[PDB]
Design a protein around this ligand. Structure first.
Ligand SMILES: [Mn+2]
Ligand SMILES: [Mn+2]
Ligand SMILES: [Mn+2]
Ligand SMILES: [Mn+2]
Ligand SMILES: [Mn+2]
Ligand SMILES: [Mn+2]
Lengths: 336, 336, 336
């Protein structure tokens, strides 16, 4: 009565994909929550596989290249992440979902790269307020966390400037394998690329007009019509509304409600094809103490949903009754 | 043009059903709001019938029994509450709704017991994030506010350990008479009992998929198909989302919006069968000052809705016009 | 690919329509946001036309008349506003929308008066938690911001007491030209007038039962069935829920979500008939610093939506490519 009985947990404290310090504390934010306990109580065995140590070079070793900030730290980290994720996914080759906690969203390049190595025909569900598909010369900031998909999408490779250290980062995604949910702050060039190459996307406008139920169904239909493909669920916490997840770097008003987020994860989990879920952009150094607790709370409910937790309840593993303990019940007292 | 023209108000400052101090201040939180004024302005006569004094024994007199905390305080209080509620309901035998403000949710046992004495064929609409139907040996905490329904449901009596002081607490509810709305944190054993005995329930999952309109309709259909039965509306404030009701003991994210809560109450009120509404688990000692004000505010809008307040507006009792005061109108000035 | 390429911006710091100081800082709250920048990035040319200086008389010059507070300041200000708005609308006679930032809602009398002078067959979409249609002798407070529509509606003129200084304020609206969205706190007499004269209105109850999509469609159908008429969008910030717009004078719980507000504005904008949009009741002197930022943020997203900003994204004005800069792409590197 569980689609998944085992699961792996992995921390990736990336903080070089964006300038605000604190995303490196993301994994600890979840580890010090009651997440592991709650999962165990659901009958799921969660193995903490530790953290991936990101490569963080200094200014001298990693200067700007094509406007990109920390691009060599990114490429080295991408490859290290990919190696670890591939290793974990192949050791598990019911399926054993990998739960990844970031860390800024730049980890997704290495995270999907490794995942695809173990499961090449996967699809990606990108839950985010942002496209994260800026090509390097289009990026206004040069922040890597705004470009993780551009290196993975084959159709975009004529817009990615060549770099030797990026050679191992092989584009492993077709535009037809990605679906967006929650978009509300696209750069114009992202909009151009998404429409041009036919990437399936459902913005908050769509969520408003169609309702989250139809959006989820349409998204899954677009990139995984018969539930044949493994699912890579890349969940940016900023997809949720700032009212429920304020502690994140680029909050955008009018987001998914926690319930809507729960629905996406519940449906994805119930397909039986959840292979990797990653939660990005938690920053416990942002906002007040209560802000952090709200964000942590949302993250925990979201992740529990991915592993199959059901708001409609779970049956107990052993039903208990009074007679076994030698205890008189009220019904048994009235019968006498 | 009012389904109810009179109503009674009753405070029950129960605080022995759960360990956090402050639920005893719940009634005062509402009394010091503009609730009474707003009700009067709607043309409803509200009579404050005072407070029920709970029985609060000391540690020596009330030790743990079957893991339960303050179980004798509970049983004595249950009977005292039942006596008062029965008395009030029979004095009113248009109907005169009883509005009850808690106080933690353990009051419901005595509150429904008394109500059923005056109206035996009633149905219960339980609006809560929790089932509140833990049997004593299944309760993790032993807190009485997590068990008020288990003593009332006939089908559960083989799971309730017998106690002499509990004899007067006669199970007066059939499983088929209860409907849940808003559930999102069921203990596994509660889930077992609810499904086993066929108790109608609609979780936040259901609210998401069906919409609150259909859920309300289905709930009423399940336990009161032809509006024949009196309604006992037991409203736990924690059913609402923590964003609108943070000042409560066991807040759970992803709850009913205030509007959804208003819809439940508006529909229940409009049946003409609202006999008792109780609002439980207000704790003004929890959260910030603004938190308390938000929670108080939500409580007031919820309770006003129960008494028949309409967001679409009310007609005035006497329409006024300029000519009666000897005043020249603009239309009357232009005619000259 | 833009319905509007030009737009005018206008501040009206009215603060004599209600007793709480700070609505006069409303325009500055928006001017010091990134509103202008964001609009420019959408390809729209926004011309700041400055502020209208309200007439603010002293106590001696402006005593109570028929219970009204600052009624002569109101009438003088109404006429000054009307003169400026008419002038701006006729200079623009694609259409050039006028964006007005208040200021309390009493500005609407002069604002609609001037607008109607330039476009007599307009319709009004009133987005507010309140009717703002109290007639002077019915007003409990005498605050002008609760009466701006009563002076404009022809059918109400037998309920408006005549005043010499109000003669120039000619009622230019028929009841059939106004539609309400978002109502949840009507005075009884307002309810009487709205129902009596057949003013189209959709309360939060309607929004709950019908959904915002149907409400918007029905509202537009009621007062602008074939998109023939110019639209006057009068947006009271208190229409939105206090959770997203706390910094306002008369907040009422259970309001429109930001998304619902965005939907109203998006639809109105897309008709191509948005002639004037005004945003009223911003008060940055109310609430905490974060409260002000939330309210400012909501205001900015709302106003951007009115000018045609699309959450589904915009195409760039010039698509850029690597070859023009003499840069080697990854696709161009692999081909060699
Ligand atoms: Mn994002
Ligand atoms: Mn992202
Ligand atoms: Mn509860
Ligand atoms: Mn409860
Ligand atoms: Mn208002
Ligand atoms: Mn207003």
């Amino acid at each position: 009565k569980l689609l998944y009985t085992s699961a792996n947990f992995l921390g990736i404290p990336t903080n070089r994909g964006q300038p605000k310090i604190g995303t490196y504390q993301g994994p600890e934010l979840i580890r010090k929550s009651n997440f592991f306990q709650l999962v165990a109580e659901d009958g799921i065995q969660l193995t903490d596989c530790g953290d991936i140590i990101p490569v963080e070079l200094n200014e001298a070793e990693d200067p700007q290249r094509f406007g990109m900030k920390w691009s060599r730290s990114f490429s080295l980290t991408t490859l290290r992440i990919a190696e670890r994720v591939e290793e974990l996914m192949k050791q598990s080759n019911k399926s054993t979902p990998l739960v990844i906690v970031g860390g800024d969203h730049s980890m997704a390049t290495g995270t999907i790269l490794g995942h695809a190595e173990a499961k090449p025909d996967l699809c990606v569900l990108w839950i985010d307020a942002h496209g994260d598909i800026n090509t390097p010369l289009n990026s206004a900031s040069g922040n890597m966390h705004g470009m993780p998909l551009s290196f993975l999408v084959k159709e975009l490779q004529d817009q990615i400037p060549w770099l030797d250290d990026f050679e191992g980062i092989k584009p492993c995604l077709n535009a037809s394998n990605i679906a967006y949910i929650g978009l509300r702050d696209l750069d114009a060039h992202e909009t151009h690329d998404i429409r041009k190459h036919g990437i399936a996307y459902f913005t908050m406008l769509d969520v408003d007009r169609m309702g989250i139920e139809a959006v989820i169904k349409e998204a899954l239909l677009a990139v995984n019509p018969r539930l044949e493909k493994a699912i890579h669920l890349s969940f940016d916490i900023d997809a949720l509304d700032p009212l429920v997840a304020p502690s994140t770097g680029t909050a955008v008003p009018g987001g998914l409600t926690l319930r809507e987020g729960l629905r996406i994860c519940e449906e994805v989990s119930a397909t039986g094809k959840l292979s990797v879920v990653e939660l990005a952009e938690l920053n416990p150094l942002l906002g007040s103490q209560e802000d952090v607790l709200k964000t942590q709370s949302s993250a925990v409910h979201i992740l529990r949903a991915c592993l199959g937790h059901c708001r409609s309840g779970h049956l107990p593993f052993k039903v208990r009754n009074l007679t076994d303990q030698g205890i008189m019940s009220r019904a048994a007292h009235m019968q006498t």
